[PDB]
Amino acid sequence: TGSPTHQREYERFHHLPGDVRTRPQFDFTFGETRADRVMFAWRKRGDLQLYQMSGRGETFVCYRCGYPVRSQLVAVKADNWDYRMCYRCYTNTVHRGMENDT
Amino acid sequence: PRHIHLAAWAVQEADALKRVCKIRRKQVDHTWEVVPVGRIIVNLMQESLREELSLERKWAVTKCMDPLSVANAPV
Amino acid sequence: VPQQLKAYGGTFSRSVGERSNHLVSDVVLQSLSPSSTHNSPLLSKNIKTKTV
Amino acid sequence: PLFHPQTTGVHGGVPPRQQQRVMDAITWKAVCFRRGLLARRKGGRAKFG
Amino acid sequence: SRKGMSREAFVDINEKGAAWYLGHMQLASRTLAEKVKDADFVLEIRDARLPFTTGNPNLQKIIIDRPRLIVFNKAEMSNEDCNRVIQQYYERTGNFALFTSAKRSWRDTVEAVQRFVTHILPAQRFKTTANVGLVVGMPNVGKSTLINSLRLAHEYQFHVKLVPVCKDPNIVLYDSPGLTLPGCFAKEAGLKLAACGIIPTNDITLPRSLVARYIYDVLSAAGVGEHMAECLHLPRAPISFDDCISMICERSGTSGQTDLGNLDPSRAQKFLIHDAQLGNLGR
């Protein structure tokens, strides 16, 4: 709904519940542009960590739902990017308390 | 090789006055070391290699620079 | 030469309500999947499964 | 999705209009190729050779 | 030529197609023994020039009971005295030996196999059954050619790998595609095989220079320099391998390349311009 000077990118997904409504712990925008394009990273909610990228969307497959998901929010398990997880199942896992048991 | 290296170092020290640089401290060739001293050059070898390559014989037998020597067919 | 673009060469079945719409009831069974049960006039209303 | 599943056995599940364009292009190419082949087989000229 | 690894030392032809068997014959020893056990007789095909090098050591080490017939091809190329002594050795042994030239290995080998089956091979309990012979040999020697010829004959008649020979006495042959291939070999064995022509020479792995040098060395050791010179037609007996190469180039022509002249001794050796052999044995 505005330029970054008025609305930070992580605030775009403010209609969804979960950690996305909390300010990310790490910002990688001012320094440089990371190859993967991840611009924000949230505090590890267990072995899972949430990242947001400045791209139209990376079509990955989450190992919980199993569906291909196209979004900027990606949850990775124990820093292993080979196992991505979409924000819906990330939020459900955090709510159920299965952060370290998926 | 140790004797060769020691002799080369001694020659370089004797030339120390006008010497500009030293020889390598790690002997590349363990049977032949050459110390260049301006127009003079000293070659220290072992007996086997000296007999193999007879530079002394070649340079003693080679004829002087005759200007007419260039008046021959090409090769 | 005849045609060089196809989406599905084969033909589908005329049946709509079930796999065996044409067959008579006394020759084929009726699918008990919930999708068929939903339209079924008997299997949708009441079904008892709890046991003593 | 298919065009008309009830008539897939007739039109390959593709709109005839799209099929019409595809066949127009392919028939143009095939006619050019056939003319070239006739010229080659008859001596560079179809009617004359 | 340019390519290093020789294919003929690894490749054969099974029913499905070409295959690259790897390892040494000792690995297959067990499978070969089982094949021979389930077969009725054995037909071994070897090269007379280097018989003990062409043969499969595991076969002779493991199975001696089953009747076996050995066919030494290129007998005319091979030396006569060695052929006779090894023939006597095999006759003393329970096996049989047969030395064959080109046409002999072509058809007389099948004729002799039929004679062997009729004479010595016992009679089967039934009649519709067939006497089975396991064929063991390097495909380049001629085993592959024989198998292919039988396959073509059977296919034309109709129009595991078992190929029939004749309707009576119902002889069939089992194929052993990759049980006796050279694979990796010693330097001396490779030189011998290259000289015999069974392994093509390469500019990298085993050069023609080394092959011809080995041939010249063995001839000089035999002490046949004058006869070699006479066979090659060069004027005087050579004193060194380089001298022989130079003489060959001079004989061939003024513009005789060293490699061109070095290629000729190998062709002559393969074509029997000199009669010799490469192989040892025991009594």
Place this chain on the structure above:
Amino acid sequence: KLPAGKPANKSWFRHNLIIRRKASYRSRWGTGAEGYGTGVPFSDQVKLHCVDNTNCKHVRLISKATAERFAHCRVFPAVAHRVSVQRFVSRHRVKPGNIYWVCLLSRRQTNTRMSGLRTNFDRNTCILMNDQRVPLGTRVMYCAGRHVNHKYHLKAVVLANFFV
């Protein structure tokens, strides 16, 4: 294609190995007769003469770039190609497959010094060298160049009688 998703050129290593000059109007490989820095280093498969007592007579280069301008900052491996023969020891025991280093002694191409001198030798000349930068031959049968006066060619300087 590699890497998948962003294919690159498979000639990355040979790019480091070879020195290439962008053929543009401001950058070109001269004929070697205009001034210093003009010319072109030899390619891999160039065949050149080896002048020494060694049995070898022709040598095929292996370095993707060989020239006098940088004969001291680079190693020129090469393979004997057409070896001679005798009619009768290490020097005479070369083989047409062995690989040795080489030391440039001359180039058939026009070579220009920084002093304005231009030279055109008649033969591409080299000499066999062991991995320890010691020549295999006992002596030389050709004239070296100014580049051969570097300390990286000390034994070559000692053996070669005449320079240019």
Place this chain on the structure above:
Amino acid sequence: HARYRPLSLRARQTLSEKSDDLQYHVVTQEWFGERVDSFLTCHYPQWDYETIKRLVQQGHIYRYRKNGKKKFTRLTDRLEFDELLVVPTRAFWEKQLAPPSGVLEETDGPKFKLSATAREMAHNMVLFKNEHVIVINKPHGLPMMPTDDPQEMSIAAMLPAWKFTNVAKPVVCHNLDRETSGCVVLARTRNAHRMLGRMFVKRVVPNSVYWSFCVGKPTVNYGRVRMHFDITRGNKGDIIVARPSPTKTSKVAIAEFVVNASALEFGSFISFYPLTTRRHQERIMAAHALRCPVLGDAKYGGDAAFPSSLSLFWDPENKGLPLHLHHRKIQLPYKNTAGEFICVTAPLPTQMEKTFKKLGWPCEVDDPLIP
């Protein structure tokens, strides 16, 4: 353990229903709303939550709601009143053909002492290390697993050396030949091992490279190699039949070879990017498919891998020449501060470094084909 047969889904279900070694925990008023995972944790203190989740998610533990069918439930699903929860028993796991999940069993083994010199060697060997994975430069001659001779050194034996501040030693994720050196990967934790095991199965996108020095030069600079292997047992060793076409019992082996730089028709430097894992795929493909054996491979290029061409550098009669094959630039899922994946490289061994130096080619260079 033995006596475990491969079972189809129907066979597993039939065995589970027929077996009488099941315990039915009733859900009373007190455990009505309690979650399945908490209920199992309270009722089986000896078991671990890993075992609980594995059993529940693989169906070995289920619940019966009096419905005439056995419901398979998630770990987060609540229980219900007057319903049974069916859990197997040690008898169920042992006295039948159904194998258990690889955790519930109480198998254990002894340990082995390591010398200080060996520990220092392992520490020097280690290249990369993080909280999850280690990458180490396995040498040339050392093996990975125990050899046919029990009294021999092995990476498996040295594994406890690099158990840095962890209760349990790491686990090798993949294995290398006894003659090939280079990067080898160890998972610190069991979860890390399970996650990283999906990398080393057959893949279509290469993630690692093999730098090799091959005698001869292939006819083409870059290409693909595909060979189907039919590995079978022999007398002492194993026979490896390679064919171009597929077969019922064969396994494919695929690689992408790029000739980085070839001296001449005599020797060449190649990089292999494998898309599949087989016994000796790189060596076999170089020897036969490319017809250019590795410079130190005597098992396939016997008497041809040791050429007279490099007599000046390596003695052709020294058959102990180390294999000129080196695993390099293994790409890991874990990223770095710059956002790019971690590509762990291993320095070239002594022999390959010497050969490159003598040929004048640089050794330390980044391989762009593996980002």
Place this chain on the structure above:
Amino acid sequence: GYTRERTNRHFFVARANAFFSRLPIARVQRSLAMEAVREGRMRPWKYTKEQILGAPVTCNFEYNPRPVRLIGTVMDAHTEETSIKGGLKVYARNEETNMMLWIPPGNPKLRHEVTSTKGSFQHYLDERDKWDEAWITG
């Protein structure tokens, strides 16, 4: 078009070729040649191609350690009169080396001197034939 490649500013478009007559280029160049002569890097020479072709020249290149001494012929001469823009070709022939080299005048290190007062065109022809044969064989 985010960038430009051509400049139309008067400073650059202007040329002084019209006013070039104010400065004598030839006199300056001849003065430079005379300065070189005085310094001794070269001596004056006024010869024609017919006169010089085939003349023997001795070249002493003051390299180190041993100055290079060569004797050759004169294949060609760039100019017929003393000038900095000169140069002379030579065909030196050592024991087994045949090098054809262009030497410019005025270089303090490449002391080249035509040792004869005259040359022979027949000698030039036969030496040129020798060089051609050597080059072809090479």
Place this chain on the structure above:
Amino acid sequence: FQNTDYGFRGVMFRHGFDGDSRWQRRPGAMGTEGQKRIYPGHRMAGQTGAAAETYQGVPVWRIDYKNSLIYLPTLLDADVGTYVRFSDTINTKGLTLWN
């Protein structure tokens, strides 16, 4: 100075030899950004020639104040008669020219 005008020349003459935006390093996902136009920096055929070039820090070699001439030991890609502008380099290799 002004470079000599070579006219309108092709890519082989000017810029003649004859980064990444978004791509997936691993097979984890599918996200890319292709090139949808020509970027402003693209070596292309055009008018190569006349242009204000500036050689920096050319040493002086010889001054002839009688004829008002300065000799610089370099060759310019400019025509005779071009009005060159001489300025004094202010530093080199971290030093100052005048000191």
